Design a binder for this molecule. Sequence first.
Ligand SMILES: OC[C@H]1O[C@@H](S)[C@H](O)[C@@H](O)[C@H]1O
Ligand SMILES: [Mg+2]
Ligand SMILES: [Mg+2]
Ligand SMILES: [Mg+2]
Length: 138
Amino acid sequence: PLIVPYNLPLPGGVVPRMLITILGTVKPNANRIALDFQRGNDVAFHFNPRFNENNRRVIVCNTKLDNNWGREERQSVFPFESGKPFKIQVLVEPDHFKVAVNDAHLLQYNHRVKKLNEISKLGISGDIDLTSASYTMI
Ligand SMILES: OC[C@H]1O[C@@H](S)[C@H](O)[C@@H](O)[C@H]1O
Ligand SMILES: [Mg+2]
Ligand SMILES: [Mg+2]
Ligand SMILES: [Mg+2]
């Protein structure tokens, strides 16, 4: 597979119609997964499945600017399961990142970082076996 944490360069940043596909398997007894769409040290889009926050499963999304986290967006729909293979599809649209897991729409995240062409790296981390990480223009 791939070494986690994994850096996928996004040459020239992201743009509407860019689809990022992450294939992996959640480890047994997982605690977290994280996708970090970065603009230098800033995180434009943090996607953070938490498997045990006060014995609840929740996806936390956020943006980090100048090393400060903003206001969390929280989603209780939680399609991930410890031990199971997943596919995460992040489609860049004009106003948001659109996320589907296992071919089912999960959430959207409004663009806070406006310079989409400077979001030039995706960090993939947490309790997964990472199989593949790629992008295509649709
Ligand atoms: O707001 C998101 C942010 O939340 C805090 S609690 C975590 O330590 C960070 O890794 C990140 O997930
Ligand atoms: Mg298991
Ligand atoms: Mg999918
Ligand atoms: Mg900006």
